[PDB]
RNA sequence: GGAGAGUUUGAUCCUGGCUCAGGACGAACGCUGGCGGCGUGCCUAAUACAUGCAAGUCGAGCGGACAGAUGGGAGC
């Protein structure tokens, strides 16, 4: 796959020793196809390349795919991780990616172009948005649900 | 049809307030100021008010004064 990477944040963190404060940088990087695949990234409290390496692993480990009915997700979903709570709500065409900051990064590199998204708790909350995008894959498009249920696609939808 | 951000720590996650970006107005005050077109202009003391003006009309209801003079009269 052909990944694009986006830098969410770089916070200087610190450990204290007898000498004083010893500083490292923890980078957080989203990576994705712009076509259904996107990765978390951690940054190993050191640099951005370290973040990219872990991001590109997490794209294929965690979000095996981001389900996409057209230019939007199949259904409305609430992604929760810890005190992360994202509402991801499917939009009409030409709506845009209406989302805040770290959430936008995920949904842009996932290739989602039309979505409404409210954050209900905030602090690099990509894990929560990741859990929802996986929760869509629990009931992606309609092929699985119909196959899971024992139905047709047009039977299920209408 | 729904975007967030800053700020508690040496650093952290959370809880939690605070602050900011938006829009609105019968606005006021600064400083500054060219014109035009629509709109708006006592929110305070239902306080007190100088002055003027804001409901008068019908003579085809009306007797009546006060006029009118078409003409005769009219001293000259």
From Swiss-Prot:
Changing residue 18 to I: In BSPC 111; spectinomycin resistant. Changing residue 96 to R: In rpsE9; suppresses S12 mutation K55D. Lethal in the absence of the S12 mutation. GO terms for molecular function: rRNA binding; structural constituent of ribosome. Keywords: Antibiotic resistance, Ribonucleoprotein, Ribosomal protein, RNA-binding, rRNA-binding. Residues 3-66 form the S5 DRBM domain. GO terms for cellular component: cytosolic small ribosomal subunit. NCBIfam families: rpsE_bact. With S4 and S12 plays an important role in translational accuracy; many suppressors of streptomycin-dependent mutants of protein S12 are found in this protein, some but not all of which decrease translational accuracy (ram, ribosomal ambiguity mutations). This is Small ribosomal subunit protein uS5. It comes from Bacillus subtilis (strain 168).
């Amino acid at each position: 796959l052909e990944l694009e990477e986006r830098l969410v944040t770089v916070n200087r963190v610190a450990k204290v020793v007898k000498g004083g404060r010893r500083f490292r940088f923890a980078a957080l990087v989203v990576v994705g196809d712009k076509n259904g695949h996107v990765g978390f990234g951690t940054g190993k409290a050191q640099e951005v390349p370290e973040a990219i390496r872990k991001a590109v692993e997490d794209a294929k480990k965690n979000l095996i795919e981001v389900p996409m009915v057209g230019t939007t997700i199949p259904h409305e979903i609430i992604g929760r991780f810890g005190a992360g709570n994202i509402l991801l709500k499917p939009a009409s065409e030409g709506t845009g990616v209406i989302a805040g900051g770290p959430v936008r990064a995920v949904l842009e590199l996932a290739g989602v172009a039309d979505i409404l998204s409210k954050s209900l708790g905030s602090n690099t909350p990509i894990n929560m948005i990741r859990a929802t995008l996986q929760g869509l894959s629990e009931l992606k498009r309609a092929e699985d649900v119909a196959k899971l249920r024992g139905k047709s696609v047009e039977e299920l939808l209408g």
